[PDB]
Design a protein around this ligand. Structure first.
Ligand SMILES: [Ba+2]
Length: 613
DNA sequence: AGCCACGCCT
DNA sequence: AGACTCCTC
DNA sequence: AGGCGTG
DNA sequence: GCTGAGGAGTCT
């Protein structure tokens, strides 16, 4: 008797957001009215509204509307949605470009023929700009075009842009907790969730934690309307780039940059600057800063390197927004000055400042240092002794490299990946066991051993609503420092743990939490609780402790770069950590920091190159 | 941000 | 015939 | 070839 | 430049 998936999900979103008094203050009388109206619709009225909300926003031929599961003939249901002001019919179709756009090319040809002043053959787009130019001069004859255009097309519906705007803002709010933050996912229509969420959110069970908020993110309905606006803008720049429309992208960004400069001084911005970082990421300035970053990516594409340097120097001169992205920017600035603008003098100042900024970490930090040596250890450069200025010699210990071969075809051993091929070589190297997990092997172990500390009470504002799969500060520096004594304790305990405590603890979280959606944990990463326990037996306390300290101290900068593979031997307990390298992938900076660190914790690390044959 | 095929420089 | 757009899960 | 960078 | 896989229907 349950609702179809798309409905359950939609309703979950509605509930999750609205049961916060804070959040309700961001919707007026009129708007809440609409929300109630939705709940008043019949089931069939709801299923359909959601379907069409989940589709693209424009007119649709009533002939192209089939949903048997909803209702066998939809006329009643459409009437209802029209009565409610959720849907509008053809009678409100007045703008011409809309009538035409609705019509197909075969329909456009039939309309290019009965009208004499029109050329019958050509592309749909052509016939469009033609019929448009035709009506803009002799308006009166254009009125009878629109007349038949409508009559031809038949019956048509559209989602009403009024309420639509409300449900989006709601969906936008919901997305702050789970979505958007946990990667920038799919989302169709005009404002939506990730596929995962839309399909499953109804079924999903979450880690239990206590909602506790004490800080407003948005000042009023306006703040949230402005944030959404920038969000919409970024989404357009992002999309443009993905479609390779780099020029459109450039303009749109220039436009955005404009507005963000015009936007400073507004009273609301002082409030934002005061928000802790893990909340500051949901503010107009943050989104606008994000857009500036994309803007540097656009300039670079268009070989406008001086411009990109100017932009990067701008971004880097403020500490307010997106501080976590400083590494990427310092790194990018140095590459640009050194490689493209060939300006060696600044490249050093750049490198030096980057390395003096505590915000740069792991990969990017190493990358700067390496450029700095490549530079000091250069002739053209020797005209100086300023890279001699106390560079903390960050020499990375070296790592056993290994090469095997496999027949290329996707490889063959069955069609198989580069990783499974390696898993074979290790199987015949006396490691009967193996997981291909990359970061989630370690990550889910980190989750299992720290669950309760991760979903711990007492930190204001980190749980804002019912559908979180992590505390909002997880990827900030404040995650550790807020939970410092607790972590330091658990870490010490894990370090000292004999290999039955480790098995016990894992099982303790596993048995109570199995299934619960938690960003850190993949319940199917390990083929059973038993495998999870065998692995924690091989790695032992100290190794598990070290790995967790990093993942908890600085998840944002450490989440990436761990090896693809873990392999171990059941009876001997020997394990090895393997970073598989295809013919075309080499060691990233984050990868080399990780392998050094795992070596430091005393663990067999090995890079396995797979040559094609 | 990571993946990947490819290319420019040396 | 192949690119493109929209939709479902 | 090997190192470093782009799209 | 790619980022979901898969499919049906439309455009050039
Ligand atoms: Ba790899």
């Amino acid at each position: 008797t349950g609702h179809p998936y798309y409905l359950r999900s939609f309703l979950v979103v509605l509930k999750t957001v609205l049961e916060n008094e804070d959040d309700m203050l961001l919707f007026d009388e009129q708007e809440k009215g609409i929300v109630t109206k939705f709940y008043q619709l019949s089931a069939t009225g709801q299923k359909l509204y959601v379907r069409l909300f989940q589709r693209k926003l424009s007119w649709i031929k009533m002939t192209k509307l089939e949903y048997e599961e909803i209702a066998l003939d939809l006329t009643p249901v459409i009437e209802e949605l029209t009565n409610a002001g959720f849907l509008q019919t053809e009678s409100e179709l007045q703008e011409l470009s809309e009538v035409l756009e609705l019509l197909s090319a075969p329909e456009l040809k039939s309309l290019a023929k009965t009208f004499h002043l029109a050329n019958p053959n050509g592309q749909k787009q052509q016939l469009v700009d033609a019929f448009l130019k035709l009506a803009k001069q002799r308006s009166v004859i254009g009125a009878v075009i629109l007349k038949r255009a409508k009559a031809l097309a038949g019956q048509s519906v559209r989602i009403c842009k009024g309420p639509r705007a409300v449900f989006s803002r709601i969906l936008l709010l919901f997305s702050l907790t789970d979505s958007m933050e946990d990667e920038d996912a799919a989302c169709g229509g005009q404002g939506q969730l990730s596929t995962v969420l839309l399909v499953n959110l109804g079924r999903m069970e979450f880690p239990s934690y206590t909602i506790n908020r004490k800080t407003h993110i948005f000042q009023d309905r306006d703040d949230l309307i402005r944030y959404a606006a920038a969000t919409h803008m970024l989404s357009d720049i992002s999309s443009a780039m993905a479609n390779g429309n780099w020029e459109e992208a450039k303009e749109l960004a220039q436009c955005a940059k404009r507005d963000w400069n015009r936007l400073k001084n507004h009273p609301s911005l002082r409030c934002h600057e005061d928000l802790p970082l893990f909340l500051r990421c949901f503010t107009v300035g943050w989104i606008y800063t994000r857009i500036l970053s994309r803007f540097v990516e656009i300039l670079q594409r268009l070989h406008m390197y001086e411009e990109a340097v100017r932009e990067l120097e701008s971004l880097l001169s403020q500490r307010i927004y997106c501080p976590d992205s400083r590494g990427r920017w310092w790194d990018r600035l140095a590459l640009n000055l050194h490689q493209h603008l060939k300006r060696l003098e600044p490249t050093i100042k750049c490198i030096t400042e980057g390395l003096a900024d505590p915000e740069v970490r792991t990969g990017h930090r190493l990358s700067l240092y390496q450029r700095a040596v490549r530079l000091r250890e250069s002739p053209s450069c020797k005209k100086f002794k300023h890279l001699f200025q106390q560079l903390p010699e960050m020499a990375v210990q070296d790592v056993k490299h290994v090469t095997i071969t496999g027949r290329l075809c996707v490889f063959v051993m069955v069609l198989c990946s580069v990783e499974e091929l390696a898993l074979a070589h290790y199987r015949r190297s006396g490691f009967d066991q193996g997981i291909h997990g990359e970061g989630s092997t370690f990550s889910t172990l980190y989750g299992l051993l720290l669950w309760d500390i991760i979903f711990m009470d007492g930190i204001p504002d980190v749980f804002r609503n019912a559908c979180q799969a992590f505390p909002l500060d997880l990827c900030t520096d404040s995650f550790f420092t807020s939970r410092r004594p607790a972590l330091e304790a658990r870490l010490q305990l894990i370090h000292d743990a004999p290999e039955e405590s480790l098995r016990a603890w894992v099982a303790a979280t596993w048995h109570e939490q199995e299934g619960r959606v938690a960003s850190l944990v993949s319940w199917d990463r390990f083929t059973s609780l038993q495998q999870a326990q065998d692995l924690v037996s091989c790695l032992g306390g100290p190794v598990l402790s070290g790995v967790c300290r990093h993942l908890a101290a600085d998840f944002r900068h450490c989440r990436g770069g761990l090896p693809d593979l873990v392999v171990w031997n059941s009876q001997s307990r020997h394990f090895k950590l393997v970073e598989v390298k295809g013919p075309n992938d080499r060691l990233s900076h984050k990868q080399m920091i990780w392998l050094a660190e795992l070596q430091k914790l005393g663990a067999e690390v090995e890079v396995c190159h797979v040559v094609a044959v």
